[PDB]
């Protein structure tokens, strides 16, 4: 009836990770503004390392005349847009590294498991830093849009506008992902509950490392469209690889680059890895004939 007892708490995870999570403000001029900065959109960001590199969502910082980063300790910075990637909806920011910067705990050896308790940390509706608790509902989710699918952690940790670009962490404080999107599909007009997505941390890292190295993310481009044995070529793919190879639409591609092609997704990934300008074999079955065409890859067209 009296308590020397200890309340179940995730405060430790909070104390470890929260300081590294920042408030990102996208400020823009308005014809209305008449020379006065106004907040277009706002969200969150994660301080990845002490050099002052910050991860956030691209849609948070799009078309910004100024980007402001606010730390929980009071410090305010103006940030440099290192680069962004529409495909992953990621963007990297840079800030003054003098003194000390808090960093988000990362553990590359950690395997996120379905059912893991996670906290979402961000700045919903600009109320200030909010911590919500949920679990990992799923992994490898395509998201709301089937096409151009990307791996997503799904979580029922409450996510609202302002949470974008913020962190998802486990009870140990380790970064699990970057909260990006929530599901709103009408489906009879009701409101979807407890369904939000995060870019997995491993992907976040790789993309950040590529945006710091180059102003953008560099991928190989074949310029074809098709749906999932073998794969069918539907897209016109005009110019570039399609012209260089003179590919014929309506054909099925058995294998490419000393590797099998059962699923287009595993294939599309492979295509992106390869450097731009390289030429490799493509195996298609046209009229039940094993035809082979040489083709030059090129850097993925900017979005």
């Amino acid at each position: 009836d009296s308590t020397d007892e200890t309340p179940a708490s995730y405060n430790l995870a909070v104390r470890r990770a929260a300081p590294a999570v920042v408030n990102v403000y996208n400020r823009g001029l308005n014809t209305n503004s008449h020379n006065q900065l106004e907040i277009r959109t706002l969200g969150s960001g994660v301080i990845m390392d002490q050099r002052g590199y910050i991860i956030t969502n691209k849609h948070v910082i799009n078309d910004a005349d100024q980007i402001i980063v606010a730390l929980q300790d009071g410090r305010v910075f103006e940030a440099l847009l290192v680069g962004s990637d529409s495909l992953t909806d990621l963007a990297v920011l840079k800030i003054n590294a003098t003194g000390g910067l808090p960093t988000i705990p990362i553990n590359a050896r950690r395997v996120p498991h379905i059912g893991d308790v996670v906290l979402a940390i961000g700045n919903p509706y600009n109320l200030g830093q909010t911590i919500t608790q949920g679990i990992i509902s799923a992994t490898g989710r395509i998201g709301l849009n089937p096409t151009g699918r990307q791996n997503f952690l799904q979580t029922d940790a409450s996510i609202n506008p302002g949470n974008s670009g913020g962190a998802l962490v486990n009870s140990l404080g380790e970064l699990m992902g970057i909260n990006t999107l929530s599901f709103d599909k009408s489906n009879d007009g009701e409101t979807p509950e407890g369904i939000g997505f995060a870019i997995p941390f491993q992907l976040a890292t790789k993309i950040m490392d590529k945006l710091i190295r180059d102003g953008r993310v560099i991928r190989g481009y074949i310029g074809i469209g098709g749906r999932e044995q073998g794969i069918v070529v539907n897209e016109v793919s005009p110019d570039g690889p399609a012209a260089n190879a003179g590919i014929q639409v309506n054909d099925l591609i058995i294998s490419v680059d000393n590797k099998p092609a059962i699923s287009a997704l595993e294939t599309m990934a492979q295509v992106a890895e390869i450097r731009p300008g390289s030429v490799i074999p493509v195996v298609v079955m046209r009229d039940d004939k094993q035809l082979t065409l040489q083709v030059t890859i090129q850097e993925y067209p900017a979005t």
Binding site: I224, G226, N234, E235
Partner: peptide
């Protein structure tokens, strides 16, 4: 449906 998938373009790459």
């Amino acid at each position: 449906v998938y373009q790459f």
